[PDB]
Design a protein around this ligand. Structure first.
Ligand SMILES: Cc1cc2nc3c(=O)[nH]c(=O)nc-3n(C[C@H](O)[C@H](O)[C@H](O)COP(=O)(O)OP(=O)(O)OC[C@H]3O[C@@H](n4cnc5c(N)ncnc54)[C@H](O)[C@@H]3O)c2cc1C
Ligand SMILES: [Cl-]
Length: 485
């Protein structure tokens, strides 16, 4: 008989899951497995992202229970648990979605060896990305395209990405009963209190496949909005109704299929011939993801500056004070501190909001290394993605993909264009709520009487600016020019 394990790492969904469909074929028992390490905090992970994962696991559990099955959350490391459950469960096949991150390739190779020793067939279909990333490299002549323009050309020669896989059957082969490693008390989904977090999560975005599909349909409720979407023209100050999809946390964990997103986009584009085109279209946004996945997976030390062949080596300063002020949202620039507060409380900010705080920390004002800011984003972002995080920080720091170091965002003027009254600032910085909109982006310029009648004295209730933007930006621009020479 066939006994299979479907191993969830990413791809936390039932729809468009060719690994799950293969595991359930001609099977007498299927074991849906996630592997949880109960010491991940004894080694930089916010409760926001971790609880989002836990809610995604709880959604998978309800989905498997509705099909007569059960999600098994095994505690330990994969290389120490799988050889045991291989023999205990009489496993003949192991299925999981392919993953191209550096740690995944080391982990998965070791598990592939352990499965060969136990006589277990390993099936690893591709469904986290739109295409086989290695296939794109081979059709490009053995090299990853290094520009978005050439990447869009390659994927248009390849053609449309594969269609999403069909839905799994309404009933699934259940786990075998009375297997000691599948006992309910040891295979259940823990709470954020049980993994060790003391402070509660504060994000407003719930995890799970069910929420991801609900948010997918809400975005496609207005097909004219989807067809005319232009990413650079969207508002970074909208928080009640964000200006983009906020599907990034669901695409990172795999709660939403990228190929289903793409298939729904083409359906809209067929009936709107004046739809936006890459790179600014909504399809273009999925291609930025596909672009950074393809270059990143084929570039050594992609997440670092030293030893990275695509990243320029810049003489980044080591100022712990500036990084701490940026990290703790006490820079004195309300637009900057508001976005950094949204990072810690929501775990998500608009793309142009991330532009403002990343340029400020790096080539714009403080000249701190992009690796130090990427470490801050990696902790708090609920959509933290290894390749997308590193590639965009190199872009914003003008270390790779981007070279125009004379374009420096003003931490004062940028948000005023979208939000003159400062509604975004007042929401996340309540200390500056009664400050007149004339000084809300520059509170240090308000007369003391205004600061006192607003309950916000600079230096007492809200910090003074750590730098003068006019002085800091010119110096950073001059040092960036010497580097590019
Ligand atoms: C410094 C910095 C760090 C970033 N780190 C991350 C990260 O860790 N994880 C992450 O998902 N994105 C990251 N981004 C990219 C981008 O800002 C987010 O993908 C976007 O804000 C997500 O919002 P959305 O889902 O509403 O996007 P939409 O505009 O609705 O786009 C749809 C999807 O396309 C993809 N996408 C959109 N923009 C980009 C982009 N610039 N690069 C790559 N893929 C993109 C995402 O999967 C996104 O969900 C980063 C950008 C910057 C400037
Ligand atoms: Cl600007």
């Amino acid at each position: 008989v066939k006994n299979s394990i479907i191993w969830f790492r990413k791809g936390l969904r039932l729809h468009d899951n060719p690994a799950l469909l293969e595991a359930c074929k001609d099977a007498k028992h299927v074991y849906p497995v996630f592997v949880l390490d109960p010491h991940f905090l004894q080694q930089k992970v916010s409760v926001n992202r971790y609880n989002f994962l836990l809610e995604s696991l709880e959604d998978l559990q309800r989905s498997f229970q509705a099909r007569g099955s059960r999600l098994l959350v095994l505690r330990g490391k994969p290389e120490e648990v799988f050889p045991r459950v291989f023999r205990e469960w009489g496993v003949t096949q192991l299925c999981f979605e392919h993953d191209t991150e550096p740690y995944a390739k080391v982990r998965d190779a070791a598990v592939r060896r352990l499965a060969a020793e136990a006589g277990v067939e390993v099936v690893t279909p591709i469904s986290h990305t739109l295409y086989d990333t290695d296939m794109l490299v081979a059709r490009n002549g053995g090299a990853a395209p290094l520009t978005m323009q050439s990447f869009t050309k390659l994927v248009d020669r390849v053609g449309d990405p594969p269609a999403p896989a069909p839905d799994p059957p309404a009933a699934m082969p259940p786990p075998a009963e009375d297997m000691p490693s599948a006992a309910p008390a040891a295979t259940g989904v823990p709470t954020w209190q049980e993994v060790g977090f003391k402070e509660p999560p504060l994000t407003v975005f719930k995890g799970g496949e069910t929420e991801a599909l609900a948010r997918l349909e809400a975005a496609f409720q207005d097909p004219k909005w989807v067809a005319g979407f232009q990413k650079p023209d969207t508002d970074p100050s909208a928080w009640e109704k964000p200006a983009t999809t906020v599907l990034s946390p669901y695409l990172k964990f795999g709660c939403l299929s990228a190929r289903l997103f793409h298939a729904r986009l083409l359906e809209v584009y067929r009936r709107h011939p004046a739809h936006s085109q890459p790179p600014v279209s909504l399809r273009g946004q999925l291609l930025w993801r596909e672009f950074f996945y393809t270059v990143g997976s084929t570039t050594p030390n992609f997440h670092r500056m030293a030893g990275n062949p695509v990243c320029k080596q810049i003489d980044w300063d080591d100022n712990p004070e500036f990084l701490a002020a940026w990290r703790e949202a006490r820079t004195g620039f309300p637009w900057i501190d508001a976005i950094m507060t949204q990072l810690v409380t929501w775990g998500w900010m608009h793309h142009l909001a991330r532009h403002s705080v990343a340029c400020f920390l790096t080539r714009g004002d403080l000249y701190v290394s992009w690796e130090r800011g990427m470490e801050v984003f990696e902790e708090h972002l609920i959509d933290q993605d290894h390749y997308l995080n590193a590639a965009n920080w190199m872009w914003l720091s003008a270390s790779a993909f981007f070279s125009q170091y004379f374009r420096v965002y003003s931490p004062v003027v940028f948000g005023k264009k979208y939000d003159p009254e400062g509604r975004f600032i007042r929401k996340f910085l309540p200390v500056l709520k009664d400050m007149p909109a004339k000084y809300i982006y520059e509170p240090w310029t308000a007369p003391l009487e205004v600061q006192r009648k607003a309950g916000c004295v600079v230096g007492r209730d809200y910090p003074a600016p750590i730098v003068d933007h006019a002085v800091a930006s010119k110096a950073c621009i001059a040092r960036m020019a010497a580097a590019y020479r």
